[PDB]
Amino acid sequence: ASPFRLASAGEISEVQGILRTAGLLGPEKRIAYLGVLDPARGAGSEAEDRRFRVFIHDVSGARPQEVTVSVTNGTVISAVELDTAATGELPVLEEEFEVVEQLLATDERWLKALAARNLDVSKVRVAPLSAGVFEYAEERGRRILRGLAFVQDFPEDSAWAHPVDGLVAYVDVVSKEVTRVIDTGVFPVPAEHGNYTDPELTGPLRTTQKPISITQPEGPSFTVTGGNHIEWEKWSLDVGFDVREGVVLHNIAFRDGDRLRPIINRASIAEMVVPYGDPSPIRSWQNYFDTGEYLVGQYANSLELGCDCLGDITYLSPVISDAFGNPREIRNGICMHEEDWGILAKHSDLWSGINYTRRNRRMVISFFTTIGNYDYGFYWYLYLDGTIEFEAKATGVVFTSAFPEGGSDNISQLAPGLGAPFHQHIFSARLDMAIDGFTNRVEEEDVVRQTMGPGNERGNAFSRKRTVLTRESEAVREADARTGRTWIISNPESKNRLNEPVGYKLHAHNQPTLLADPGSSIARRAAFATKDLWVTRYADDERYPTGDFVNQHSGGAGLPSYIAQDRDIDGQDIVVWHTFGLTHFPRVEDWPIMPVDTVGFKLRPEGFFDRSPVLDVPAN
Amino acid sequence: ASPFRLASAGEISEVQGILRTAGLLGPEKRIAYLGVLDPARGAGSEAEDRRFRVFIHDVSGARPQEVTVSVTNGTVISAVELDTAATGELPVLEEEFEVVEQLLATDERWLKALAARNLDVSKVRVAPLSAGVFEYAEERGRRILRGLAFVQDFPEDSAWAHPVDGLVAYVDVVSKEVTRVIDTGVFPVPAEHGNYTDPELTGPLRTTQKPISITQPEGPSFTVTGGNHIEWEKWSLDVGFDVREGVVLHNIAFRDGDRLRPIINRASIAEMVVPYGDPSPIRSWQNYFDTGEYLVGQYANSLELGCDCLGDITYLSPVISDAFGNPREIRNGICMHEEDWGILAKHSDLWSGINYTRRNRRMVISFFTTIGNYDYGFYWYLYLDGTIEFEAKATGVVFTSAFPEGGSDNISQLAPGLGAPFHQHIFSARLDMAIDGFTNRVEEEDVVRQTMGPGNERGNAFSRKRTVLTRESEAVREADARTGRTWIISNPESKNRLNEPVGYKLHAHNQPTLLADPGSSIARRAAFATKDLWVTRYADDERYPTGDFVNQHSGGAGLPSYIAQDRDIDGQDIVVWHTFGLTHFPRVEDWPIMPVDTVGFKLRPEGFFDRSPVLDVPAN
Ligand SMILES: [Cu+2]
Ligand SMILES: [Cu+2]
Ligand code: NA
Ligand code: NA
Ligand code: NA
Ligand code: NA
């Protein structure tokens, strides 16, 4: 009955039938995106209408379409033809990945380049990568992928150990034409293998690890109702899944006494970009928008009990559409469980004689995605004390190149002749805030140092200052770790028992933002990544920081265009967009498979409650 | 047989007998510090000599002494009389805490102040706090404590809820004189209780938490030999305990194949300071050096199975001396256990068809201390992949004051009439480095942004730069989060298989450092806390960043004095001192007992290994 329930296989099959009967899903059509639309603001009329948004690609070259369908009423609501030279191309299709390698295998320029290197074309894998927008006028309005080559010595070989540097090709995947093959010179193909399950490389496996057994004899403390509604230790929320964004959290609220208090209306990772910092023309165009260009949800892994998720695990298996509109289940794609989290609070008091210890726990909601060589885990945590935290875990195999003789300022050496170009992994969290309701405001809080003098005669005082962000034009903010800068989202019309506005404080990790020159193509296309914090006024159609159609978009879409409206955000329905990321200079220890590294952010209550919210936790 | 073994009760009893027979431990003497001395550099002669350092206080006013004893040979090695106006007073004695309240209870000025407030002297607890050095000439060379008052309504009441603001007294604890009583005016004593076990405040306890059972059916994966030598998943180390520093880690090494490779010779938290930022004369002198002034090891808690430490726990029970030289065991004072730590590495490869997941674990070594209202947990973590991490956990009850009518720029309001002054909690980690041996150097690594232009035509390149710190005068460094600043400790004479020097990278949290005016007393006494990183040349007697005798020292001791020697640190035996801390603006949620907040740092291998060190981890 909940409007926030997961899409069902029956809903997707109905969408397919509605599109087919409307003439919109002939044999030349492919579904490049399909997802359920959130309820519009103020759905208090109970008039449920399950609507789906669909991007439809045409493999014959006809214009793609954006279509909205009502499953409830069985109708097409709107259907718009897209001019992709203007508004951007549709996301990459999984079926286009194979096209790149197959087309190059018959191109005479590609074969000549491989022949010069004495490489068997049957052993050459081609990584199909998004194209971006650069100097090539012939690419405007065409669907282009760029290919980089790696050698697979045998079917179980890790091709990433054997990059073919000095060679790149561009492919038009609709007309099936190789537009350019660029060969800048022969580099030796690195020869050592990177097969991390080969006993020759691992040595004998350790026999020293004894088992750790995590069980819950009475079952977990959370309940799941309606397929995806979670109640756990006073928290309440709905777990959504979208093929572009992945796990989305809706209606995060906290039961404070007999009052269910909203905190966040919708939380998601709305974009993630991986820009490379190697100026070689072989790779200087390389920037992945895993969310916007590839759709991270559709590559979600099935998670294995005992390996990927350990403990008493509750799974969700979300349903997505394939390219023909058939439902496809991602079995065990989301893991849910609680974890012990050490000491929550502790005091031993000399005067009262009371010794007091309580333990903490967190609720974990997670999924993993794999796009090419990288694997990313997305973890949302809810804690007993009201803290909300996000953590991204990056692992997999680093993207490789040759290591040039005489070194490089932009590439790490991992093995003889084997390099790994510098890059970043940058995320955008979109937080549709609802602190005690929708009238919210953001303040920037800095530490204030004070000079020794009158009123501060011993020179020990320090303070803080808060600046309200009143309009979108002043709401583009940068981190300042040295002044302890944080941001508070408060509700000026809802006060705690001390007559102060209730709030939550955003704590960032203060990692570097986008490093590229501000005049670069990537700085224009990923403008969100150049600043740590943006605040916008809520609008139905302002969903992604990079715009709706990221693939081969020339730039400026998304947040820079939204904030030009200069809307009032002082005590209004607002959205916080937080940029955070990892700057990765690969180390030898990252090879041949990378140990996890992490980045994230958290929000902690700031006078939201009238006292500690965990006084009623028992001693266990 | 190990020279790094814990002090035994028999060793301490022998020290007591040696001091007594030498005439150094008469009835007027008190042991204010006793600890074992580490072996001198190059103990390859096997000639073991267990030596103890002792600070001896005299309650009759005679000069204290610093004494070194050889338990092995049964002799006094040296005994020096201390001039405390010059070099600082001895640490505070536990028995001096009670003296303050007892002396004030008979002082006519104190009783007059309490009478004006209608407070029963039998209900007034006095917090005995260190004095520092300020404007009072009569305090030079005397042992002073300052007292702040709190009301206990009944024996089990939390007195922290009832501060008596506007009143402070200074006490000479040797002559037993109250030197000054300052009364700046009557503030209402806040009336609400803060009794966090009272059902009236907690409400009914939750019944929703189901048990989490963590067991190890085959026992833990680590072994303990010789009382305190740990071997776990290729790590090797010795766990020491000192009454001043607490847990100390010695001889941290990693078994890489058949080679035991040193990483850190000694790791400790060598100082921690808690400066308050309230300019009221009632509290503007308030700065705790928990390590240097109070000795955090002697207030270590006994840790309870299932509450403080959960899982398959191995305990150490260190032995310390009481004030009379008798051995005292801190039962279950150190917890040791391993913990699951999520995914270690994961990749699903499209081309090879191989799906690979491995799980991570960490070894945990921890203790908890309680000094007055605050409780601190100190956690050392070793991870499978070679990462070393430290985390401090701060909890307990915040220090309180009145909340002034009309507000404050330096105090948070927690309850009606109840304030909590702003403060910091700042730690100093002393890391006696030994990356593959003792020839080490430190480099500062910054991200380098590059301008679009020739050689970088698409404006995507970025790089990094490393600056070697060659002399101590240039080795006082500050954080720069915006440029991704880290520090690498490397061994220039030990190279990995790529002919690069092996190293470890220090990742800081980049929190604000000491906020006080640089001309303040606390900035002079806690100079270490004004900068994020210091590097010194190793010397036997340079143990603490604040000097040997911190209590009532006028300033400048420790790191600022050491680095004036301007010694060569480029490929030498060096020590890294890292400052890190929390800036605490108390929130309503911190009351009446504070949920844990954390801060720390970590070190990760940086080309120390020839490839990932966790390829031999099994699938479990
Ligand atoms: Cu990376
Ligand atoms: Cu604090
Ligand atoms: Na355009
Ligand atoms: Na909102
Ligand atoms: Na002095
Ligand atoms: Na050293």
Residues A512, B465: Cα–Cα separation, whole Å = 15
Distances (CA, A) of A600 to A428, A538, A580, A581, B430: 10, 23, 7, 8, 28
Phi, psi dihedral angles at B563 (to 5 degrees): -70, -15
Among A43, A49, A387, CA closest to A235:
A387
A369 interfaces chain B, CB cutoff of 8 Å: no
| Nearest beta carbon to residue A347 from set B156, B458, B593 | B593
Residues B469 and B346 both lie in one domain: yes
Q: Are strands B501-508 and B462-469 parallel, antiparallel or unpaired?
A: unpaired
Place of tokens 């000025």: B109
Q: Can you tell me the distance from the alpha carbon of B473 to that of B560, in angstroms, rounded to the nearest whole number?
A: 10
* DSSP 8-state symbol, A290: I
Q: Which residue in the block uniquely carries the two structure tokens 């490397």?
A: B490
- A35 contact partners, CB below 8 Å, separation of at least 6: A7, A52, A53, A242, A243, A244
Measured distance CA(B262)–CA(B433) in Å, rounded: 9
Structure tokens at B22: 């030498």
What strand order describes the sheet that includes A144-151? A124-130, A144-151, A167-172, A177-183
B290 catalytic? Reply is yes
CA distance B539 to chain A (A): 32
Question: What SS3 state is found at B115?
Answer: helix
Look at residues B243, B218, B258 and name the one whose alpha carbon lies nearest to residue B295. Answer: B243
Sign of the C-alpha dihedral, residues A236, A239, A240, A243? positive
Q: Are A51 and A78 in contact (CB under 8 A)?
A: no
Q: Tokens at residue B576, please? A: 């890294």
**Does B207 lie in the same domain as B61?**
no
B592: preceding bond cis by omega (within 30 degrees): yes
CATH of residue A63's domain is 3.10.450.40
Q: Rounded distance, CA B239 to CA B6, Å?
A: 8
**Phi-psi map region of B582: left, alpha, beta (phi>0 left; psi -120 to 50 alpha):** beta
Task: Let me know whether A305 and A377 are in one domain.
Answer: yes
Total domains in chain A come to: 3
Final residue belonging to a domain, choices A178, A195, A212: A195
Q: How many Å apart are CA B160 and CA B398, to the nearest integer?
A: 8
Instruction: Show Cβ contacts of residue A3 under 8 Å, excluding neighbours closer than 6 positions.
Output: A39, A43, A48, A50
Task: State whether A572 and A608 are in the same domain.
Answer: yes
* Co-location of B102 and B212 in the same domain: no
DSSP string of B151-198, one letter each residue? E-SSTTS-GGGSB-TTEEEEEETTTTEEEEEEE----PPP-S---TT-
Among A396, A400, A340, A338, which residue's Cα sits nearest to residue A597?
A396
User: DSSP string covering A174-185, please?
Assistant: TTTEEEEEEE--
Instruction: Enumerate the H helices of B371-485 as residue ranges.
Output: none
Q: Where are the beta strands (DSSP E) in A110-228?
A: 124-130, 144-151, 167-172, 177-183, 213-215, 223-225
Q: Looking at the structure, do residues B436 and B504 belong to the same domain, yes or no?
A: yes
Q: Give the HSE-up count for residue B329: Cα atoms under 13 Å, Cβ half-sphere.
A: 8
CA distance B436 to B455: 38
Tell the burial category of B352 from Cβ atoms under 10 Å away from its Cβ (0-12, 13-18, 19+): buried
State the virtual CA torsion across A538, A544, A549, A550 in degrees, nearest 10. 150
The torsion defined by the Cα of B182, B552, B272 and A484, in degrees rounded to 10, comes to 60
Q: Is A562 annotated as a binding residue?
A: no
**A2 CB within 8 Å of a chain B CB:** no
Encoded tokens for B205: 């306890």
Q: Are A104 and A147 in contact (CB under 8 A)?
A: yes
Is residue A75 domain-shared with residue A210, that is, in the same domain?
no
Ligand nearest to the CA of A586: 1
Distances (CA, A) of A169 to A128, A147, B20, B458: 10, 5, 86, 18
Peptide bond into B190 cis (omega under 30): no
Instruction: Choose among B546, B527, B549: nearest CA to B141.
Output: B549
The domain containing residue A72 runs over which residues? 1-87
In one-letter notation, the amino acid at residue B217 is P
The answer to whether residues B573 and B469 belong to one domain is yes
Domain end position, chosen among A87, A122, A155: A87
Sheet holding B75-81, edge to edge: B29-36, B51-58, B65-70, B75-81
A315 is in an annotated binding site: no
Q: Which of A64, A87, A110 is the last residue of a domain?
A: A87
Tell me if B316 sits within 8 A of B239, measured CB to CB: yes
State whether residue B318 sits within 8 Å of chain A by CB.
no
- Contact (CB<8Å) B618/A206: yes
Q: Is A342 left (phi over 0), alpha (psi -120 to 50) or beta?
A: left
In order, the DSSP letters of B494-561 are EE-TTS-EEEEEEEE-------S-TTSHHHHHTGGGGSSEEEEE--TT---TT-S--TT--S--SHHH
Tokens coding A601: 């952010």
The amino acid at residue B476 is V
Ligand nearest to the backbone CA of B395: 2
* One domain, residues A61 and A130: no
Q: Helix, strand, coil: what percent of chain B each, to 5?
A: 15, 45, 45
Q: What are the two backbone dihedrals, phi and then psi, of residue A96, each rounded to the nearest 5 degrees?
A: -80, -20
Of the listed B157, B290, B432, B532, which one is catalytic? Answer: B290
Are A529 and A511 within 8 A, CB to CB? Answer: no
Strand segments, DSSP code E, in A139-176 are 144-151, 167-172
- The full DSSP string for A538-555 is --TT---TT-S--TT--S
Q: Which residue bears the tokens 């967190």?
A: A362
User: How many whole angstroms separate alpha carbon A619 and alpha carbon B6?
Assistant: 33
- Distance (angstroms) between ligand 1 centre and the Cα of A128 equals 18
Same domain, A404 and A473: yes
Residues in chain B: 620
Torsion of CA A369, A370, A375, A381, to 10 degrees: 0
Contact B39, B267 (CB under 8 A): no
Method by which the model was determined: X-ray
Q: Are residues B293 and B275 in the same domain?
A: yes
B129 forms beta bridges with: B146
Chain B CB within 8 Å of residue A456 CB: yes
HSE of B370, CA atoms in CB hemisphere, 13 A: 20
The owner of tokens 């349903």 is: A319
Per-residue burial over A161-170, b = 16 or more CB atoms within 10 Å of its CB, e = otherwise: bbbbbbbbbb
CB contact under 8 A, A375 and B196: no
Q: How far is the CA of B254 from the centre of ligand 6 (A)?
A: 17
User: In this structure, are residues A501 and B588 in contact, taking their beta carbons and an 8 Å threshold?
Assistant: no
Please report where in the chains the tokens 């397929």 appear, as a residue: A227
Q: What does each C-alpha distance from B192 to A428, A616, B216, B371 come to in angstroms?
A: 44, 18, 46, 24
Residue of B263, B588, B620 to mutate, testing the A interface (most A Cβ within 10 Å of its Cβ): B588
Contact A614 B595 (CB under 8 A): yes
Which residues of B carry a binding-site annotation for Cu cation?
423, 425, 584
Size of interface A-B (CB pairs under 8 A): 433
Structure tokens at B362: 């960490």
The answer to whether A143 and A97 are in contact (CB under 8 A) is: no
Q: Which of B152, B411, B543, B263 is nearest to A354 (CA)?
A: B152
> What is d(CA A17, CA A13) in angstroms, rounded to the nearest whole number?
6
Burial of B155 (0-12, 13-18, 19+ CB in 10 A): exposed
Distance from the alpha carbon of residue A269 to the mean position of ligand 4, in angstroms: 16
Is the distance from CB of B52 to CB of B35 less than 8 angstroms? yes
Alpha helices in A385-537 (DSSP H): 521-525
B177's tokens: 């004189």
Provide CB contacts within 8 A for B610, sequence distance 6+.
Answer: A588, B496, B497, B498
Contacts for B573 with CB less than 8 Å, ≥ 6 apart: B41, B438, B439, B440, B537, B538
Q: Residue B389 is part of a domain; what is its CATH number?
A: 2.70.98.20
Beta bridge partners of B23: none
Backbone angles phi, psi at B609, to 5 degrees: -100, 165
Question: What is d(CA A614, CA B565) in angstroms, rounded to the nearest whole number?
Answer: 52
Residue A234 is inside which H or E element, if any?
none
On the 0-12 / 13-18 / 19+ scale of CB atoms within 10 A, A380 is buried
Calpha distance A362→A384 (Å, rounded): 7
CA distances from A14 to A10, A395, A569 (A): 6, 38, 40
Which structure tokens are listed for B124? Answer: 């007034």
B616 with A521: Cβ contact below 8 A: no
Q: How many whole angstroms from its chain centre is CA A240?
A: 14
Closest CA to B352 of A423, A595, A162: A162
Residue (of B232, B249, B562) closest to B434 by Cα position: B249
Q: Is the dihedral of CA A280, A282, A285, A287 positive or negative?
A: negative
Based on the fold, state whether residues A492 and A553 are members of the same structural domain: yes
